[PDB]
Amino acid sequence: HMELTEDLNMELRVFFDTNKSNIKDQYKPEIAKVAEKLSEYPNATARIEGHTDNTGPRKLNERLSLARANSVKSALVNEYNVDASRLSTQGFAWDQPIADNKTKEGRAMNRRVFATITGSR
Q: How far is CA 97 from CA 75, 101, 105, 120, 121, in A?
A: 24, 8, 13, 30, 34
- Residues at the binding site are 19, 53, 55, 61, 68
Residue 55 binds which of a copy of itself, ligand API, none (CB < 5-8 A, kind-dependent): ligand API
Residue 96 interacting with ligand API (CB under 6 A):
no
Contact positions vs a copy of itself (CB under 8 A): 1-15, 27, 30, 33-34, 37, 117
- N-term to C-term CA, the chain: 18
Would you mind telling me the total number of residues written for the chain in this entry? 121
Measured distance CA(32)–CA(22) in Å, rounded: 16
Using the rule CB under 6 A, is 101 a contact of ligand API?
A: no
Binding residues for ligand API, rule: CB under 6 A, are 18-19, 52-53, 55-56, 60-61, 64, 111
